[model samples]
Target: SWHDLYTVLTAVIPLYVAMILAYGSVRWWKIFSPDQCSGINRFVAIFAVPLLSFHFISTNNPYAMNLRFIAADTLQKIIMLSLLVLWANFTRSGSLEWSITIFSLSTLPNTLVMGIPLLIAMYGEYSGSLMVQIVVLQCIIWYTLLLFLFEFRGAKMLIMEQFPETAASIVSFKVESDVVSLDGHDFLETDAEIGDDGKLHVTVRKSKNMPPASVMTRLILIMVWRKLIRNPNTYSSLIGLIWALVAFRWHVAMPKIIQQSISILSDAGLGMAMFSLGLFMALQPKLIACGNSVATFAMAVRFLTGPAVMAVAAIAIGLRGDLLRVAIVQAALPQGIVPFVFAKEYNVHPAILSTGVIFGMLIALPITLVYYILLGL
Candidate 1:
């Protein structure tokens, strides 16, 4: 038993050392600047991580996957999210943005950067496929929801700013072909022609049977769709999942050469991703004035309440052995960097997110180790 714990330590210690080195280098040596860190994050998210996801997902046996595990996991997230939203509403101190941020903290763990390596180190290669299951589900479901929220909020703000008096009309218009002047803001563009009445006729381009929703609505939908399609991880997950299903059904295998090529990028993703996390931590503003209540709620939800729910759901749904352990440990992972990135991008309650991330990481190992020990390794 001690040997097993020691082996886990062997895996975890090196990762923490890597994180510490990255923090030190960025904080003291200035080897990687914040802009460079952002670039690295984009590179990993766009290129390396997708390759990793594709390799694991394409090769896995879809039929053998524990669908109940995924279903239980989804239920836990939904229940936790609802509770946090209710808490936010009852308190009347946090907004939708805050509730979303809290939800992200509660459920979205640092799986790619930390969970993968840790799980593999403890449970071997099979753990990787398990981790990929969660990754695919998160990319397809949670990420899409988050992106939509961001786009909708940003578009609504822009519309309100431009057409304060006619915001509702701008948000939802029923017009065959109409033009409104928005002082030529970048968001508002219109094509026009001189009419027989000597008036400008703005053209609202649409299919013959297209609905007469507002141009803004169309623009927002287009933007959201483009964003979802453009995300490399999401696209790769879809491709990988399809391939896995086909391969599983037909007993086809990916060519060895292509698998190897993908494996190289996939294999390198974990370290680079962890380093990126450290660099991101360095870039964050020091937590000077975060709301205590918000931070407390976030920490409790992520570190304590979230994992507790996951464990109960895993057992209740008949997950046993490594599957149950993996589920619980994944739930125990620190809050993901993506949530903080979203918070920063949206100018939401980022400070609370930052505080929670820091605190969660500080306690993650101990909490995870306790779970493992309690489960008798």
Candidate 2:
């Protein structure tokens, strides 16, 4: 019976082994430079992850999805996001950065690395397939949303810098439209006149047609689209899903050799994910670079708030028995390696997220076992 629990333990052990080598290499040995660590993290955002996303997602049976499970998973995320934004708005201390950071901790668990193996060992194959569906959704939906949130914050700052002049000019242009029936403030309305010399003098009002608020929104969204488009991670996710549907409808299997090709890098994902993490540790002055108290806060949010919220969503969505148990356990898993990759890639104060990944990975087993026993207790 004790050996049954060992399956979950053994699966996570190798992840730590990979993390240590790189951490020691750079931290103590000085083999990799600081710039090199940043480049590796950039690669984490661009390549390794999406390949893994495709590998897991491409293999799954799209028809086998559990709608109730999907509904619960989605609702849980929605509820947290809503609450986070509301908190940001209502409080002086909160802002967009905190909302995104906290939202990730509370909603997105380490589904890829720890979840599939850990939950399958805890429950069964049903739990394993259900986890793959969540990974599908995470890679395709929520992870993409995470990128957009970061870009939204990034573009928002650019708007603040450029908006004042744009706003003033918009008002200047609009006032002319308001006073002149022939003119449009938010839309372009032009008037041309021949002066005393009889030369053709043309006057143009370009969006001397759109509102300042309207123009500002486009500035925000336009920049976001460009940034999101440049990252190949975005395309591969949607492509995986598109292929998922085609394969399911046509009843096809990827030739094993091609499957082999996809996994060459896909399998490198988590190993490299933790390896890059070690690079980060080497660069940091302290192990938990964000410090003990703040790291503790992430743990509270990751392990405590995340599972509690999932439990609430699970019961509300009518999950019970072994099914409901997996929902809560999955929530309790840990912060995803992918979100940390994204956090550093986008330059959001990534320290908190980095700590969440490290500490959560190390401590998740005991916390998860407690949940397993308590729920089934």
Candidate 3:
């Protein structure tokens, strides 16, 4: 029993060791410069994380998939999206940015670093299989969708800022139209000032979130599509999928040189992520990076709401017994470091995401241990 406790601790404490070591380095010792911290973040974003994704994705044997659990995972994402959309439109605080962050907090989690041995030892070898399936799925499907969500937001913001209003429904304003038509594609430039750089600077009383969903969807999509080419994380996940399929089909072992080369850094990915997270904390004004209230909200999302949703989804999809409990516990694990990287990488409330990770790590064991008792009962 002490061994189990020690085992979970062993899996968990090294992460904090990295965090604390780096945190103290910047927090008090003043060892790292702001530029050094920023560069560290860039290296993780460009190399370590993509390689980490590839490593996780490539290792899973494609033959060993569990569809029922996969369905439950998908169902959770779909439900979160629907509910967040409903919340976004109805509340004054409702907006696209909040939706993206909330979805990430609720759906993505620290399954790989703290999850694998923690649960496997708790539940046995089958538990390992279930988690491997999840991490692989996370790389291939969930994280990819998350990348798209980030891209859409970027494109939407750019496209929103680029728009010139046609001013329909704001009844007090004088609406002028300078409409040019080319092959059924209309360019409506009403109040546009071309900058010295010769790009349109928009002036509209009400900024449309996006302009004309009918036509602008394609343009925004093109913008979204164009930028993805430069996102290195893009192809790594895909190329790994192909590699896995080919390796599995022909029963070929990856060359030791290539495998060892990847192993060297993919192994370092987790520790560096924790180190980067610590650096982020040092840069923040408080340990609770998102402020107390926001941290509380993020913690609640991570610990409370996420598990409730996952339990219902798993039960609804017919996951019963130990696996059902595993699913809930899986959802209840710490907020993912990779998602923090995602949040930081794109600057989407990194303070809040970082807050979630630090606090979630501290509190998770107790909550999950209590959950262990309850589920056992």
Candidate 4:
């Protein structure tokens, strides 16, 4: 039934659209300070997300990590990134910043909200249990390797922006629209300046009180503390583990009343996030600009590579019926919201970065719809 298809699309697409749009509305209207949006987004990434993760994973059954499939896909992302890096290097447009942005888009498929809904539709409730490990691997790569790439790229940009001469060189090189080598004395020019000032501008605004400075600071500190004491990307896992331990050992069940409260809070936060993503989708112009060729190429490789890796992994590992299908389904997912948010946070060609994400997603929609339609038949 159309309703069945709509049901999945409605749940998945709208949530992303909401978050993107909410962000766009704020940015378009100039409703909040950049710092404020940063804080709020930080809250979402660090706090609320960890809480959700803890709640979900803690309650989820534990299992041995699928080391073979994990190793294969991890190697695949590495190979894809290596090819990308080589592309950037050969074109003389490679920089650590470009590397990170490209690697991230290539490796990080939109697996969170989008992956969940699609998986449920394709494979049903048990999907989460099977796919959680792969998703967790993706998350680890995002924070550690991706974050490191982002930071290094950011530092280079800061130096360039601080020095107008480098900025001038940066601008002058763009006249020909060349793809410079990573090893050469060239920058990828990830950003395209829009107004008269000719400086790159990135925006992701949110409500005023959504993310205060104090709140952002505390959240960072908390992540820092967790990282200092535990394995990378293990902070949230640890938090959830502790909570689950309490629940299991102490039998401190979440009371029905409190459960209701947590549920409301979670739903509201996620709903608001989704609404913002939607607005972002509508507001963002889908013009495939010339300078965006590099980004588009980057997206293409990612979309193809992630799933290709899954195909091989699923086959070699001999995953049966649903598990095999789940890998393919997950690999086919569009770019997730995290890539854009990370782009904005790291200040790496936000608009171009977003364009790649939005474009990939726009491309993914019909593909997803078609998949479901055939599956239903």
Candidate 5:
């Protein structure tokens, strides 16, 4: 078993690293056409990832429930999130998406696809189910909240603002408007007129379409409902948890063969995702133009903090067994695609995020090897 565990880690970690390297090379060289990488990205995002999450989480065994474990892990999550925000401030990159990226890194693991398979390889089927609880807390809660935070906090209306050329095209077409939809305060409406000299003049209204306070009230209500619907991790988890409770009460036992099949699918999905991620990395400029001082700080924080502060917190929080082990390994994990996603969403430099994720993953491969040796699993 020890031999098998070593063999698995040896194979898996290198495969992941090679994929990342390929991505970085492609990015650095720009050999592949943009269309090729675009297709790969779509395949990874739309098909592989969601299916992996749905299948794995849905088929989780109900017997692996522990309140103390959940509570402690949840608290660790809070600390990680707080620290990411603090770290962003220290880095002097206070962009909201960066804040979200740091927080997600600190909290979320590639749990569904990566963690489950790794645990099962080292432990057993039962351990896979138990290990998924951590995935649930991170992927469902941490990741879902992350999307909303990125929208609200990162850069409001960034997509509309950033893509001005596309907007210019759309603005030429006049579309039918709804009266009730057009409001006063949020969508301020002013009057324009030809003045005494026959020049076009605009007058800013004093009363200014405030709409009798109803608009802000309705806006607040809409925001709450919108947040609930748009937040996948939280609401989806709530739905899944509720279903899980019902399944447990009714003694739902997903067949072992079926579970194994889904597990395989999860592994393949992750492998594909990681491979695509690697190709993407290859398109980036390998060496950044950052100052030596700046590069030093970025590398120091990302590489050091994961294994250092995070591992200490995991131990202090009393996480033992695979939780502690996984925490250590994942904390030392390379920067994820999440930062790149955040940059694209917020109109920041996607290349910077791409460079960081790719370079960070390269750094992570060796560090993770060290972790596997230290953990003795």
Candidate 6:
């Protein structure tokens, strides 16, 4: 019946309504200033979303996971990312920020706020669990990669600014066992002077009892590791996952009050997130000119290329029936709101990224309906 198809339409209404309400409040009523928008976004990112993730993941039965489904999802993402990177390279837009934003748009769908509701409405409760798996994968895998890419690119910029011509050489230079100290007081000391034939003569001073190359390597690794673990998102994900394993395996029970508190906060997450997005949209940030080829390219990647890549990957991985259909549909979901969170944090590509989120969602809806309708037939 037509009524059955209406569920698909209604499932997305709440999200759009929340966004529209926030937008109206900001644009017409002045309820939220830009600073207030930022603050609310921070709360959602640092508090609500993580709590939501922790609570949902903790309560879910991980044993219900379909490994093949996870594999297909993972492979689909890998292919999407690789193709985006290659496209950026071929088009000579290979800057780290450009590549990262494209990758985010290409692969990270609005799974939580939109996909889960639609998946459940279309399939059933079992699809809810599958959606959870995709969320966990997105947070653990894609988010980490996004952060790492940002950090690495930032560090590279800093080093290049300081060293200029020698940046490449410095980053590529191999460290020897005696070059650096382990105590952190002394490190590899080098002096460079311009020599004949436009070459730089370098002098190195080695500290006694310096740590071996492997030790220093591990220490550097540990530094990056510590940074990652200290991130609220990362730590919460780890804690939630660990608790899920322990509670499911040993019947560990959280206190009733604690559980209720987390649940209450978790319940507000999706609404608040959608509201933040609406407020963001109200700001009307400047967007890249419509005729810009890169903007057009990004839009294509988001709506067209990404889904096709995912469908092929799903079929290649033997994901059939509902699994295949869901995987493909999810790939076609709009770019996530999280990209704006990262954009705000790093101040990178805000206009272009915002454009992707807004237009991607606007354009993806009809495409999504067509996909669903075809599946139904």
Residue-level lDDT tens digits of model 4 in 1-377: 78676667766676655656666666566665555555665556555555555556567543444566566566666676767778887897666666666666666776655666667765677776555655666655546555445433433444345444433322221212132112223443334445466544321111101222443344334333433354323666666556666767766777789667656655554554454354555444554532556666766666666667667656766665656556666666776666676677556667766766666666777766665565455
lDDT tens readout by residue for model 1, 184-211 = 2323433445557653334333331222
> Which residue segments of model 4 deviate by more than 4 Å?
1-50, 64-69, 81-94, 152-235, 245-261, 282-299, 371-377
lDDT of 6 by residue, 1-377 (tens): 57757887788788888988998898888887788888998898788888877877887777778999889878877776777678767886566676777678778888877788888987888888898898888888787777666655544443444456563333222234454222223454446666566644444344412223443344355434645756777777788899999998999999999888888888898899888778777877443434478778878788787778788888897878887888878888888876766775676776667778877666666888888888777
- Specify the highest-lDDT model's number: 3
For every model shown, what is its TM-score relative to the native structure? 0.78, 0.80, 0.80, 0.63, 0.65, 0.80
Task: Please give the CA lDDT of all the candidate structures.
Answer: 0.71, 0.73, 0.75, 0.57, 0.55, 0.73
- Model 3 gets an lDDT of 0.75
Q: Give model 4's TM-score versus the native structure.
A: 0.63
Residue 345 error, candidate 6, Å? 3.3
Alpha carbon deviation, residue 61, candidate 2 (Å): 1.8
Worst 10 residues of 5 by lDDT: 170-179
lDDT, residue 141, model 4? 55
The C-alpha RMSD of each candidate to the native structure, in angstroms, is 6.0, 8.3, 7.4, 12.9, 9.0, 7.0
Flag regions of model 6 displaced more than 4 Å.
Answer: 84-95, 165-223, 285-295
What is candidate 3's TM-score against the reference?
0.80
Residue-level lDDT tens digits of model 3 in 195-289: 57544434322225333454345543443455455667668867887898899999989999999998998887888877887887688776676
lDDT (10s digit) by residue, model 2, range 1-377: 56766876776678778888988888778788888888988888578877877777777888878899999999888899889878888989878888888888888888876688777777888888999999888876787687667655653443344343342333211112122111122343334454565433323344423344654455445545655666676687677888888999998877889878877777788888778766765676766778878888889988888878888898897887888888889888878877777787676768888888777876877898888778766
Worst 10 residues of 3 by lDDT: 167-176
